[PDB]
Ligand binder design. Structure first.
Ligand SMILES: OC[C@H]1O[C@H](O[C@H]2[C@H](O)[C@@H](O)[C@@H](O[C@H]3[C@H](O)[C@@H](O)[C@@H](O[C@H]4[C@H](O)[C@@H](O)[C@@H](O[C@H]5[C@H](O)[C@@H](O)[C@@H](O[C@H]6[C@H](O)[C@@H](O)[C@@H](O)O[C@@H]6CO)O[C@@H]5CO)O[C@@H]4CO)O[C@@H]3CO)O[C@@H]2CO)[C@H](O)[C@@H](O)[C@@H]1O
Ligand code: NA
Length: 827
């Protein structure tokens, strides 16, 4: 026998009603006790007969009304049940509740018809989704994107989502705001993108140590190649995570390798933080430099040399860095830093931006093949529109620059979208040439001198020659040093210059290492304005001829001079095993300057086709190459398992922090077996490997949680996006995951870490006043360990509220707190 009592759910548990943490969604599906198509015969449902909630329950009558009209005007009209555009067009929130429901019940008969006709609940589901977008309060737009399509919410405490409550979530505790005592200042904000991890929670801080220890012992712990272990870190988003963790990493690295005393041990376990805010240098300096500061000089370099229009004066290569090189003749004073011409984020900014120019802010279909073709094309032209001008000159500056650990971009040596290392860039010959010159000649003090608003001479005086007047200590002193002349005006008048090479280089012969020509660069003097060898006068002054050139390699002038020698030479300074200062980890000096970093990836690095093309395998094959190039320290891509749907599959979208790929399931870069082998190939050639460690976010966690949220600016303070705002809302965010990796390995090394190094777990963190807590392992990430998430494209009106004001609820399984309460139309 039949009746409408059967719209009732078959059971008020999770087996028949969709719920997240006990709560219901208007996008949710449930199993009624029965359905009907005509009104007369009602059929019991099978456990496979599931129907969307938005057919039976609505946020308000206004919405019930729009659900009815939308469905009718989209294929679900039937006049034999009184449903045509004509029968629904006058209905409104003012209509009798008793009438509207009869109309809704009749629509439901028609929906059952379409399901029968189509033999599936697909077009229904696709219609529910399309319907929802029409409704302001129910749509993704209710979560209030900003005008650029960006935004974040914060996770807060709430009586309904109390399992997601935290005592911590200290936000934007970065840099000089580790104590939360200058929120208004120069810190660096909490939220980038993704599900933001609360690195202020003591338990999280313990998990970060666990992680770091696994990574520093990767090959061993995983039973892969046992010499396949990382030596250090590149810290992603370091300005955007509670600075406690940077303290804590420092401490682990000091405990494990004894770095404070020994520059040799410090220098063999290099770490560098991504983050250029000058406040960051201050912080690092005040802390004794546990990591290397990221210097801003690449930005200067692109601004002075790289632009087509609007080029900043040449003097800025002198002062536009955390190090002033007007005349830098001292050691252990500079902030220990790493610098570059290009990084992964600059190259992406440019390719995106080309994407929106070539397609009017449109649907982002993958015409990034189009942007990349345009880049390669502009790259080769003299009169470039986008791509950096003067790329050889920028590396000339960087590789001659004292008091930095320079970082080379894979993409500046190779065509980054072709298969890994398959295609050398046009800039390969220049750069590699300058890299090899560095090992052989670049040492001693530095003087950068203006000779025009557009011309500069950067001279290094050679190993063991501290400044212009020094005689020379080292036996390489005489035959080392370098002049790098850079002009940034292609119209510069032909002219003679003088370059003071220092008193250590009176009456000395100088090879034309690299000079500009009509077509580009010559490596042997052919076609330049200067001969292959020149000699200094009795005062050590070099006379050189320079002019403006304009071709794909140079828009300005570039020339490099190094001493003539008969032999290979290496001016690298070994570090001693007791430091000029016991308060310091890293020190900016000859030893640290002898290091050189290589970024071994690009975000637009293509998926490997075969196993032979795994970057890890190709890296293990060319270890000696990097070594030959004077590279000492290999920055490797985040090797973690990624979100399936990610744009670039590049490493920053982390889904498992411990799964670095297996034989059948590699990252873009390869399997973890293969990772270990590359690492050990590098070691075998005397190089060191650092891992990109991503403590800031995870992206693609599959498990939804009901959490309570407040539309917030990117510092975790509530914001008032175009008039509107919202606080204390229920939100069904994706917050939970980790992979088997987080489960197998999460917290596993903490007892070993406590036994060997107890100070880690007694040292009170600055932001919390409380030491990392190793007594709870994290085997799965969830909201309780997260500050919030970037906007997730779901909307804020999904949570079902009963007419009386309370959210609908189910005592389900783990969900057993309060008393069950379902809508009228489901019981
Ligand atoms: O395409 C083959 C080619 O892949 C490599 O390049 C890949 C890259 O390194 C890797 O990161 C990946 O990135 C994405 C991936 O593109 C996504 O598809 C996604 O992967 C999930 C995927 O959606 C699912 O299909 C599923 O994948 C696997 C099983 O779990 C595997 O065990 C495997 O089983 C066998 C299969 O049945 C056979 O037909 C045969 O292929 O042999 C397999 C055993 O070796 O394949 C199924 C699918 O058939 O689960 C995946 C999640 O783990 O998410 C990844 C990011 O998370 O995709 C790149 C290519 O698009 C690699 O370089 C080449 O060597 C390789 O031959
Ligand atoms: Na953060």
């Amino acid at each position: 026998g039949p009746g409408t009592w059967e719209n009732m759910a078959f059971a008020q548990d999770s087996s028949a009603i969709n719920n997240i943490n006990g709560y219901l969604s208007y996008t949710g599906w449930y199993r009624p006790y029965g359905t009907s198509q005509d009104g007369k015969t009602w059929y019991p449902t099978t456990v496979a007969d599931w129907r969307p909630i938005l057919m039976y329950v609505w946020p308000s009558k206004d919405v019930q009304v729009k659900f009815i009209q939308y469905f009718v005007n989209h294929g679900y009209e039937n006049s034999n049940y009184g449903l045509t555009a004509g029968s629904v067009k006058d209905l409104s929130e003012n209509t009798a509740s008793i009438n509207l429901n009869e109309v809704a019940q009749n629509l439901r008969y028609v929906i059952e018809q379409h399901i029968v006709a189509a033999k599936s609940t697909s077009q229904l589901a696709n219609d529910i989704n399309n319907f929802i977008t029409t409704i302001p309060e129910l749509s993704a737009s209710s979560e209030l994107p900003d005008e650029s399509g960006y935004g974040q919410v914060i996770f807060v405490n709430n009586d309904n989502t109390s399992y997601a409550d935290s005592k911590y979530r200290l936000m934007s505790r970065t840099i000089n705001n580790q104590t939360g005592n200058d929120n208004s200042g120069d810190n660096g904000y909490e939220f980038l993108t993704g599900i933001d991890i609360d690195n202020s929670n003591p338990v999280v801080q313990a998990e970060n140590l666990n992680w770091e220890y696994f990574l520093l012992n990767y090959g061993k712990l995983m039973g892969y190649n046992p010499d396949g272990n990382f030596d250090g870190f590149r810290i992603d988003a370091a300005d955007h995570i509670d600075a406690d963790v940077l303290d804590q990493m420092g401490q682990l690295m000091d405990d494990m390798y004894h770095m404070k005393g020994n520059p040799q041990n410090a220098n063999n376990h290099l770490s560098y933080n991504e983050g250029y805010r000058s406040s960051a240098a201050r912080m690092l300096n005040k802390k004794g430099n546990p990591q290397l500061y990221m210097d801003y000089v690449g930005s200067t370099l692109g601004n002075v040399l790289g632009r087509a229009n609007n080029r900043d004066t040449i003097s800025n290569l002198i002062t536009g860095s955390i190090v002033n090189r007007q005349n830098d003749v001292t050691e252990n004073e500079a902030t220990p830093n790493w610098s570059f011409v290009t990084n992964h984020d600059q190259r992406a900014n440019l390719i995106n931006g080309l994407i929106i120019k070539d397609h009017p802010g449109a649907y982002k279909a993958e015409y990034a093949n189009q942007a990349w073709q345009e880049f390669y094309a502009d790259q080769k032209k003299t009169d470039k529109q986008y791509a950096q001008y003067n790329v050889p000159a920028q590396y000339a500056i960087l590789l001659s620059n004292k008091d930095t650990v320079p970082q080379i971009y894979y993409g500046d040596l190779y065509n980054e979208t072709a298969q890994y290392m398959q295609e050398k860039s046009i800039y390969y010959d220049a750069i590699t040439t300058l890299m090899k010159a560095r090992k052989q000649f670049v040492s001693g003090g530095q003087t950068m001198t203006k000779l025009s608003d557009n011309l500069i001479a950067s001279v290094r005086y050679g190993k063991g020659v501290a400044n212009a007047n020094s005689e020379g200590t080292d036996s390489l002193s005489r035959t080392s040093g370098m002049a790098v002349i850079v002009g940034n005006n292609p119209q510069m008048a032909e002219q003679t210059i003088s370059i003071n090479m220092g008193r250590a280089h009176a009456n000395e012969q100088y090879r034309n290492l690299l000079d500009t020509t009509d077509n580009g660069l010559t490596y042997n003097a052919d076609g330049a304005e200067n001969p292959e060898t020149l000699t200094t006068d009795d005062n050590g002054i070099l006379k050189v001829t320079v002019k403006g050139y304009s071709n794909p390699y140079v828009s300005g002038y570039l020339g490099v001079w190094v001493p003539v020698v008969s032999v290979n030479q290496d001016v690298t300074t070994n570090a001693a095993t007791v430091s000029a200062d016991s308060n310091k980890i890293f020190e900016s000096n000859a030893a640290l300057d002898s290091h050189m970093i290589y970024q071994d990836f690009s975000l637009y690095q293509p998926e490997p086709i075969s196993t032979e093309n795994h970057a890890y395998n190709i890296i293990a094959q060319n270890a000696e190459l990097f070594n030959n190039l004077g590279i000492t320290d290999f920055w490797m891509a985040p090797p973690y398992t990624q979100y399936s749907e990610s744009r670039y599959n590049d490493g920053y979208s982390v889904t498992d922090r411990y799964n670095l790929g297996t034989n059948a399931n590699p990252t873009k870069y390869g399997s973890g077996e293969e990772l270990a082998n590359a690492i050990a190939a590098l070691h075998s050639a005397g190089l060191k490997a650092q891992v990109d460690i991503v403590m800031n976010q995870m992206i693609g966690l599959p498990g939804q949680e009901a959490v309570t949220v407040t539309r917030a600016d990117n510092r975790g303070m509530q914001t008032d996006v175009n008039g509107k705002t919202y606080a204390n809302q229920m939100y069904f965010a994706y917050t939970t995951g980790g992979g088997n990796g987080q489960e197998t390995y999460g917290g596993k090394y903490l007892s070993e870490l406590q036994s060997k190094y107890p100070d880690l777990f007694t040292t009170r963190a600055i932001s919390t006043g409380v030491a990392p807590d190793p007594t709870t392992h994290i085997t799965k990430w969830s909201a309780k360990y997260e500050n919030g998430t970037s906007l997730q494209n779901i909307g804020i009106g999904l949570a079902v509220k009963l007419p009386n004001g309370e959210y609908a609820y189910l005592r389900s399984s783990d969900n057993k707190s309060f008393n069950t309460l379902l809508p009228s139309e489901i019981s």
